[PDB]
Every structure is written in C-alpha cells, then in structure tokens.
Ligand binder design. Structure first.
Ligand SMILES: *[C@@H]1O[C@H](CO)[C@@H](O[C@@H]2O[C@H](CO)[C@@H](O[C@@H]3O[C@H](CO[C@H]4O[C@H](CO)[C@@H](O)[C@H](O)[C@@H]4O[C@@H]4O[C@H](CO)[C@@H](O[C@@H]5O[C@H](CO)[C@H](O)[C@H](O)[C@H]5O)[C@H](O)[C@H]4NC(C)=O)[C@@H](O)[C@H](O[C@H]4O[C@H](CO)[C@@H](O)[C@H](O)[C@@H]4O)[C@@H]3O)[C@H](O)[C@H]2NC(C)=O)[C@H](O)[C@H]1NC(C)=O
Ligand SMILES: *[C@@H]1O[C@H](CO)[C@@H](O[C@@H]2O[C@H](CO)[C@@H](O[C@@H]3O[C@H](CO[C@H]4O[C@H](CO)[C@@H](O)[C@H](O)[C@@H]4O[C@@H]4O[C@H](CO)[C@@H](O[C@@H]5O[C@H](CO)[C@H](O)[C@H](O)[C@H]5O)[C@H](O)[C@H]4NC(C)=O)[C@@H](O)[C@H](O[C@H]4O[C@H](CO)[C@@H](O)[C@H](O)[C@@H]4O)[C@@H]3O)[C@H](O)[C@H]2NC(C)=O)[C@H](O)[C@H]1NC(C)=O
Lengths: 208, 208
C-alpha cells in the first residue's frame, strides 16, 4: 500500500522574507492500477485550498511518487501553526493523515562569540576566523560574514550540534588572506534566529 | 517493508592494530508475520562467512530489529575493499544490498589549532575551549580531550564538513569550569587520523 511522508520547510526559508517556505506531502508506493491521489490540507484544523499539485514520477520499481506542496506563511510557521496533509487513494482502506509543525520548546537566543586565528596558523598563507554560535533553540539558524559593508563568501558553517543542556551550537569558519588579518581589516559574523531581537545580531573580529 | 542500514568501523578501531574493526548491518521494521532475516556478506563480490548475527530484539513499535556484525582486517579496510550486506525477508519485493568502503582519494594530514575562549565569554561561569582540526582526508577521524593525565568528558564535536579544496574540517568544543581555566590547568585536544604520524597528534592549551 501507499505510504505518506511530510516534510518541513528549509530552516533558511523560514528566516528570510524573500524565500518561500513550503511543507511537502509525499506519497510513495502508489500503484499504476489506482494511481490517483487526493490531497487535503489543514492549518490548525481548518482546510486550506492553495496547495500545488506536482506531476507524478514513475520510480524504477514501477510505482509512482506523488507530491503536494503547501506554501506556509512565515509567521504561521514561527507561531507553531500545525499543518496536516490527508491522503486519499483507492488502494487505501481509509485516508492517511500526517501532521507537522515547527520544533516545540521554549526558543532560546544564540550567544555569538568570535575567535581570532590561532598563533600556530600564521605559519600558513590563509587564516581561519571562527564564529562560535551557542545556546540556541530551536536549531533553525543562518550565519554569514561580511566586511566593510560587503559580504564575505569564502566561509563554511557546521551543522547545528546538540549540546548537553538541550540547546544547539555550531561554528562558522571564514577563510581570508592572512595579509587582510595582519592589516587590521574588520570582519563581522552575522546570525539570524527567531529568538534574537529583530531576528538578527552581529559580532565583529579584528586584529589587536 | 523492512529497511537496512550499514555502518562502518569506528575510526579508532581502524587506526589501531590492537582493536576489533567491524562493519554492522542493521535491519529494522521486521514484522511478526515475516520474522525471518537472512544475511549474505561479500568482500569484493566474494561471499564470506564469519559474520555474527545477533538474536532478534523486539521493538516498542511492534517490529523486530536484527543486527549482523562482520569483523574485518585493518589492511583489507585501508586497501579500500568493498563490504556488501545482502538482506532477505519474506516481506521484501527484492533483497536489499548495502555496500560500504573507505573513501577513495589520497590521504591529507590534519592540522590542529587550539583556540582559547573569547574574551566576551569570560563572563560566564563556564567557558569554551575550541579545537579546530582542518585539512584532513578522508573524513574518518577521532577527537578527544584530556587534562592532568585524565580524559575530559564534557565536550561536543561537529561532524566533518567539506571545505572548498576537497578536504574536511571540524571543530571540537570542550566546556570547562571558568575557575579551572583561570587557575592554569593545561588542556589538550587529541586527534587520531590515518595521515598523522603514528596516527596521533596532540595540541595543548593554557591560559596565556
Ligand atoms: C520504490 O522506490 C522508491 C525510491 O525512492 C522508494 O521510495 C522511498 O520509500 C521510503 C520508505 O519506504 C522513503 O524513506 C523515507 O525517507 C525519508 C527521508 O526522505 C528524504 O531523504 C531521502 C534520501 O535522502 C530522499 O530520497 C527523499 O526523497 C526525501 O528527500 C527529501 O524530500 C523532501 C520533499 O521533497 C525535500 O523537502 C522539500 O524540498 C523543497 C526544495 O527541494 C523545499 O525546500 C520544501 O520546503 C521541502 O519540503 C527534502 O529537501 C529532501 N531531502 C533530501 C536529503 O533529499 C525518511 O525521513 C523516512 O524515514 C523516517 O520517517 C520519519 C520522518 O519522515 C523519521 O522521523 C524516522 O526516523 C524515519 O527515519 C523514510 O525512511 C523514501 O523517502 C522514498 N524515496 C523517495 C525518493 O521518495 C519506495 O519505497 C520503493 N517501494 C518499495 C516497495 O520498495
Ligand atoms: C520502529 O522502531 C525502530 C527503532 O526505533 C525504528 O528503527 C529506526 O528506523 C530509522 C529509519 O526509519 C533509523 O534511522 C536511521 O539511523 C541512522 C543512524 O543510526 C545510528 O544512530 C541512531 C541515533 O542517531 C541510532 O538510533 C541507531 O541505533 C544508530 O546508532 C549506531 O548503530 C551502529 C550499529 O551498532 C553503531 O555502529 C557500530 O557501533 C558498534 C558499537 O560497539 C561498533 O563500533 C561497530 O564497529 C559500528 O559499526 C553506531 O555506533 C551507532 N551510532 C550512534 C550515534 O549511536 C541514520 O544514519 C539514518 O539516516 C539516514 O540513513 C541513510 C544514511 O546512510 C540515509 O541515506 C537515509 O536518507 C537516512 O536519512 C536513519 O536516521 C533508525 O536507526 C532505526 N533505529 C534503530 C535503533 O535501528 C523503525 O523505523 C520504527 N518503524 C516504524 C514504522 O516506525
């Protein structure tokens, strides 16, 4: 029989007003005989009608994968609205319902610390500037770097990691030419997270 | 239907000739109507017979979990040999095969930098010591901490993260009592990786 999986929006889509956070209802093991899937969607129990139907895909094992995509309001997802996908198909005895929402739990604001390059690293041509972001909940977060008003893009950020108190941490690493560090340029780590004031905070790092 | 997960040996087990490196094949969602699980193991397509299959354990959601453990040679694993688990159960349309092996590519030696806490973090009663381990390949690595001859426990380590030159980096975060750090105790980050000399290096950190 068919089975249903329900996926949340991307963390980063929820935190950016220009992005479209979507909840995705996915039905697998849909037979060729009875391939037609009906989707009903509910927001805090009340039905909504604006979901997008996607064309099915046959799946090598000769079953269809069938998907419905519901756009969620940024503030609805953040305020813990519950989203329910109800799937009806001829090969089911009764419809299947799956439900999802943002991670529950008291949100906690990230603490942001910057760490200069280690001394031993100045033997090398490039240096690591480190941004430690810790104590945040839930784990949805976005971290960037900038300098003299313009984005720095040669950085990598670890996934959030669960700490012992139940909150999360991560590190972001900005690589810059050691000449820029020794020359005293000013670099900043910026963080977006629902629990920050204006969902935004930034911390600078420079030689001294 | 049931699902199969295949796990590699522990980085520490492969880096020491003195330890037992094992590949583990885990089958979950084994029902009551079809409780039989048959395992076939292969090394480069040749069947092998030394696997130890465990008694099945019933799960809370009314499924069975069945584990098969295959002990392997260090020199077979570092020679990039492929290890294949084939799982058979009456409720599978076809048998499931998983394969794992050591990642291909030339080994690259990690560099290890220790980082003291940010000056802004010397306000809290706990402080974070950071170990940055970068430049290594493959991603298999073990990181621990010690002080005054005994192991530290209160640390968390990020998964390895792909850098833009194809090598990996991670951070490890050791949390310590601020007074223990102010009173001059030496802390060290210990790293094991196959491209380090005798598979081990150590970097120590103290209040400066
Ligand atoms: C016939 O062959 C098909 C071949 O696939 C089989 O189909 C599979 O059936 C499996 C169950 O039997 C099912 O397993 C579940 O997988 C999920 C996780 O699935 C994600 O990751 C998979 C592997 O990495 C992907 O292949 C999946 O496609 C899926 O990827 C995610 O898909 C999301 C929705 O499209 C997408 O989110 C959206 O992305 C867009 C932008 O792209 C927007 O941002 C939007 O906002 C998002 O919503 C994700 O980005 C995408 N992620 C990735 C990495 O690709 C797994 O969670 C689940 O098991 C878990 O169940 C719960 C939660 O669901 C969890 O709590 C449990 O702990 C448990 O681990 C299942 O294992 C497969 O997904 C599915 N494969 C596909 C492609 O559908 C059939 O089963 C075969 N039939 C038979 C009889 O064999
Ligand atoms: C009914 O109830 C059961 C039981 O809960 C459910 O079973 C679960 O189904 C999940 C999938 O649907 C599956 O989720 C996958 O988990 C893996 C990671 O698994 C490890 O980490 C988990 C926690 O993070 C643990 O729960 C697991 O037990 C597992 O722990 C590891 O186990 C290894 C085997 O022992 C061990 O390695 C060995 O350790 C020994 C120790 O002595 C030796 O060192 C040996 O040499 C080693 O080989 C590890 O140490 C141990 N690790 C830890 C941290 O404990 C996860 O990767 C996976 O996610 C992805 O899987 C593939 C990635 O390759 C990916 O492609 C997919 O897209 C997917 O996203 C899944 O999350 C659960 O693990 C599983 N739970 C258990 C206990 O088996 C059923 O699903 C339920 N059924 C229904 C219908 O509800």
């Amino acid at each position: 029989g068919p089975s249903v999986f329900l996926f949340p929006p991307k963390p980063k889509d929820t935190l950016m007003i220009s992005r479209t956070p979507e909840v995705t209802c996915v039905v697998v093991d849909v037979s060729h005989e009875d391939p037609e899937v009906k989707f009903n969607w509910y927001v805090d129990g009340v039905e909504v009608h604006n979901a997008k139907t996607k064309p099915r895909e046959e799946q090598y094992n000769s079953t269809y994968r069938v998907v419905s995509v519901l756009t969620v309001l940024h503030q609805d997802w953040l305020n813990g609205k519950e989203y329910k996908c109800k799937v009806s198909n001829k090969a089911l005895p009764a419809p299947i319902e799956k439900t999802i929402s943002k991670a529950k739990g008291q949100p906690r604001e990230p603490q942001v610390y910057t760490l200069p390059p280690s001394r031993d690293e100045l033997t090398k041509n490039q240096v690591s500037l480190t941004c430690l972001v810790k104590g945040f909940y839930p784990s949805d977060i976005a971290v960037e770097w900038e300098s003299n008003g313009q984005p720095e893009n040669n950085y990598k950020t670890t996934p959030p990691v669960l700490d012992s108190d139940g909150s999360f941490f991560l590190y972001s690493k900005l690589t810059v030419d050691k000449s820029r560090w020794q020359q005293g340029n000013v670099f900043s780590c910026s963080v977006m997270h629902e629990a920050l004031h204006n969902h935004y905070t930034q911390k600078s790092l420079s030689l001294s």
